[PDB]
């Protein structure tokens, strides 16, 4: 459970501009994501995540250390923003965009651990803002005019779609990626075999659960995802 006091102090201290050197900066350039950092001395390194992962797989020490620092920093950012401590998610959202995190997470060449960290940040930064709220599934109150003469599944989600105020959902592509990932993992003969992949699977499952509880999904999509979830379970 988040501790507001110490969280606020760390928010005001680590994000303070004087301490910006320790924080690695990721930027999307014409697109590809590039990481910029500074060594212990006064030299600045600018590279890209793809080559970093390739060299880490090869066995280069510096690449592995930099990648480890980046994932742990991402974990620290995700932990900082827990419980809607807005003073931080404002800065994090400005620094890290939805599209940038989507690009980093969706691509497969990156290590599973980094993808899991990105998923955690995505869930605890952008999904957990407050243009949303928990949606009660069953609503006792119903209007005599709203009740249609004939109701089907599509007609049922039509009213929910109309109620939604977001003409273009900002997380729709995230839902698509979640669906593809779950389809791939269920398609695999052994859904839970690789230890590293388990972290990413748990992360995407948590992201999906929080997305569903906010009313993003539709009844037909809910049923399809339910079938896939039952498949992965057994």
């Amino acid at each position: 459970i988040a501790i507001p006091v110490t969280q606020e102090l760390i928010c005001k201290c680590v994000l303070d501009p004087k301490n910006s050197d320790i924080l690695i900066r990721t930027e999307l350039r014409p697109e590809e994501v590039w990481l910029t950092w500074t060594d212990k001395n006064n030299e600045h390194h600018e590279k890209s995540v793809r080559q970093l992962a390739q060299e880490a797989r090869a066995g280069n020490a510096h690449d592995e250390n930099v990648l480890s620092y980046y994932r742990y920093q991402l974990k620290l950012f995700a932990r900082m923003c827990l419980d809607r401590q807005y003073l931080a998610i404002d800065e994090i959202s400005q620094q890290l965009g939805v599209d940038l995190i989507f690009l980093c997470m969706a691509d497969e060449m990156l290590p599973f651990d980094l993808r899991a960290s990105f998923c955690h940040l995505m869930l605890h930064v952008h999904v957990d803002r407050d243009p949303q709220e928990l949606v009660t599934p069953v609503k006792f109150a119903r209007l005599w005019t709203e009740i249609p003469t004939a109701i089907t599944i599509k007609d049922y989600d039509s009213n929910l779609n109309a109620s939604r105020d977001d003409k273009k959902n900002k997380f729709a592509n995230t839902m698509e990626f979640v669906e593809d990932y779950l389809n791939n993992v269920v398609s695999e003969a052994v859904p839970f075999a690789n230890e590293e992949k388990n972290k990413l699977t748990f992360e995407v499952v948590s992201l999906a659960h929080n997305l569903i509880y906010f009313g993003f999904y539709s009844f037909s999509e809910l049923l399809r995802l339910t079938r896939t979830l039952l498949g992965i379970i057994d």
Partner: protein
């Protein structure tokens, strides 16, 4: 990590089963409305329609429910306590669909009168505004927001109204909108002693 995701999947399934109940309630109300409008611009037909759904597109799995019980039993056989508790709860709820559906259907309000429509609209608007302000309580706990909240609370207090039958109907309606959750959340708002406006709004909430 492998067990927590299973528990989360169980939670997803538990929530997704409620929207099925909502759809069933909507279908029952639609059948009612069709029957009522047709007869007055029958009981056996609507009874047959209501019985048909309960036991097939709404099925959780394509296997007819066997898969759902299979995973529930397998999870129940595991050692994790929360996972087994969730599996047992789902198993029991799976074989009591009709009882829960009828029990929830009995507690349904139609809001046919125009007056009821106006109360619904105004209450929903005020609840949304108050919830939005409460979610950002930390900003204004220690102004325009204070007077806005006070006005909303006073408007709701006047909205309560008078009349035994009107009182009961309005109380049921407010319970349907779940306004008591907003009230309780506002009561638990962080407070600093010595703020007259905060005490005034707290008194209005009480």
């Amino acid at each position: 990590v492998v067990m927590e995701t299973k528990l989360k999947i169980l939670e997803i399934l538990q929530f997704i089963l409620n929207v099925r109940l909502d759809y069933r309630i909507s279908y029952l109300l639609s059948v009612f409305k069709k029957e009522f409008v047709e007869v007055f611009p029958n009981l056996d037909r609507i009874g047959e329609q209501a019985e048909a759904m309960f036991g097939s597109m709404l099925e959780v799995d394509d296997e007819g429910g066997r898969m759902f019980l299979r995973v529930l039993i397998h999870l129940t056989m595991h050692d994790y306590a929360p996972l087994v508790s969730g599996a047992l709860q789902l198993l029991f709820k799976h074989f009591s669909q009709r009882q829960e559906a009828m029990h929830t259907f009995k507690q349904v309000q139609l809001l046919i009168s125009a007056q009821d429509v106006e109360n619904y609209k105004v209450i929903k608007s005020e609840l949304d505004r108050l919830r939005t302000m409460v979610e950002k309580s930390e900003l204004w706990v220690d102004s325009e927001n204070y007077q806005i909240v006070k006005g909303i609370l006073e408007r709701l207090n006047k909205m309560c109204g008078v009349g035994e039958q009107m009182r009961k109907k309005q109380q049921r309606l407010l319970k349907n909108m779940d306004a008591h959750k907003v009230m309780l959340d506002l009561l638990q708002i962080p407070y600093d002693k010595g703020d007259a406006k905060m005490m005034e709004i707290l008194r209005y909430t009480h």
